[model samples]
Target: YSDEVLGATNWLKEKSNQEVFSFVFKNENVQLNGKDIGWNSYKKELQEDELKSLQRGAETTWDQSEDMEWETTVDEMTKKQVFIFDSLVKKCLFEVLNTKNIFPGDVNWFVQHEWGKDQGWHCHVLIGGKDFSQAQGKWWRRQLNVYWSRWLVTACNVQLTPAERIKLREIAEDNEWVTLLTYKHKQTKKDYTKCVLFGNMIAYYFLTKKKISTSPPRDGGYFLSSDSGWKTNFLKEGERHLVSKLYT
Candidate 1:
């Protein structure tokens, strides 16, 4: 798969002298909050067959939902957007990598899934090699706010309000231990739903770890609580109108 992708990208590069390809892969061992939630289970070690099954599941999911309408196409404008964003990240990564003697690690750039594709798609990156802490802090946020936002506006024509612009700049300036971008949908006029984003990541990691038998960490996990409920309005509305009124 890597070979095929690289081959196509190489051909494009040769023809246009443009770097047009970015790949996203699931990491086998990604620890969250000091837990080894990787391919190897904290409790049960997976067998070779189990590992293969996990990989197959991921492939199937990817195939089913790889390309959706939300993704900007490979046109001149969109291509430029891709180039600028990709280059910004690459440059930022390289700067930190060089200064800290770190190396480039696995990164996943996702497109939207068709069924629940309303939120649009973005990249989920994994940076390894040497001190990940410094790289994530100093470099990632800086590029995301400064270079990344500039590219978004220039290449994709995404206009930002004055307040939004201030927020973006603030993100660049602040040195918070945790920082993330919040995108607002034009249709809903609401911030992108967290449940969809969180659920997909959970599902990806679960498949990567070959934990199909067990349910992925849902509500009651670190970032969520049972009472918080899933962020699906349809589900919430149904629960309220249908389930909550049963005894009333």
Candidate 2:
């Protein structure tokens, strides 16, 4: 019965030459595989854990704000700040893939989509290569900073002044806490704070849109996720925050 259903679906797809039916089958396959059976399962589990982590992080932000009597709206700042920050991370990942050939072999990169939404969309990427020692890791980290900054200037139309760039360098060097700049909804005020323990994992939320599709008869194939979203302005805001935090 399953074979018959797949055969009919493939026949219709071949005739129509539209991907609608294919995606339907792919989604069905995901469901049939129990949604927890393959890499998708791992991806789903990681995303749920990350959401919980974000919620916990949010609570921490609230507690700190209350303790310090810091006037800030948690929801507004978190959403916007995360949105922008995630975009910058994506840009960094893309630059790494494009320029540095960061991922070699069968390693896959991940990205998240509407991560906090009910759909739990996001990416999980694994850039496979040599494991860097502390020293080598530091070197690569510096490279990440340089590339991320340069990409922001060229791709996002946001210019980082020399002072601002220096500030970012200081923050990166400090390495004690991941810093995020929170802009209130009114855009009248901004806050810079040391992000706590879980904040560092924010970078892992990025998943590459590209994937390998292994449907029958075709041997192997490649596919891209259509659910991903990208915007230049949001990324610009994130870059601006990094620059601002650097100076502060």
Candidate 3:
């Protein structure tokens, strides 16, 4: 209702030539720097004179992280299938959020790639529903793990296909995929698969500001979904190192 907001809207209508521009300003809680922000406050503060935009809650189940994904594709970015990968990840995210009934307030997320290692990638995302609280929850519902696991199940539920679902169930009852990261026992020395905790929920778990980087935590997870056999082989090869070792 301020001149800034109205002017910002006018500015936006100017940029609205692009379809996505229309979609972005289309909501009260749009993404700001990869994380969700309170649009009303953000717009109010910015619109007072100019335009601007805006993470939180704290905690984790691991040393400093949550949620882990192991994708099976190492295909080059030039492949036709690689092209549509971004959309597929979006589809799954929405599918899980809406169908499973989870509301994502702030999404501090990212995906890493190992092109030569394989066309595959690893996704590490941290979603927060609580407000500025990082300590372990007194109860399970508020617990960060319980809070994020709801969507973690949704993200990796790539078991959408009948065949994939069958495989998932055969391997685990929860119908979730296994994490490639593992740690050995101190005494038994038996190996155990690591569970993607949904995030370390560490510092900047819910970053209020925006910054971009080509490093460990950039923001957002993308999957290269290709039913191509070649893609499948490359994806597997990406994880080949997990099982193979010896200085290579």
Mind sharing the TM-score for model 1? Answer: 0.29
- In model 1, residue pairs whose N, Cα or C atoms come closer than 3 Å (at least 3 residues apart or on different chains), thus clashing, are 24-108
TM-scores of all candidate predictions against the true structure? 0.29, 0.28, 0.26
lDDT string for model 1 (1-248, tens) is 23423332232223221111221211122233343322212112123353335334333432332234334222233222222333333443445446656433322122211111222122333333224322244344444345433322233222445655454434334523123433455766753311122223322331122101112222211110011111111121122222222211
Per-residue lDDT over 1-248 for candidate 2, one digit per residue giving the tens place of the 0 to 100 score:
23423332233223221111000001001222122221121211123343445434433432332322233332443243333334444444445545655553322222332231222222222222233222233334444555444433233222445665454444433441111222234546543221111112222112211222122112121121111111111222133234223222
Model 3, position 129, has a per-residue lDDT of 36
Residues 1-248, candidate 3: write the lDDT tens digits. Answer: 33422332333233222211000000122232343322111111112111111101011101122123432232232222222222332333434446435554332222222121221233232222323123312221122222223322233312245554343334332322212233556766754433222222111121111221122223443222111111111222223222122111
Candidate 1: misplaced stretches above 4 Å? 1-75, 103-121, 133-168, 171-248
Residue 151 error, candidate 1, Å? 7.4
lDDT of each: 0.29, 0.29, 0.25
> Residue 170 error for model 1, in Å?
4.0
Better of 1 and 3 by lDDT: 1
Alpha carbon deviation, residue 145, candidate 3 (Å): 16
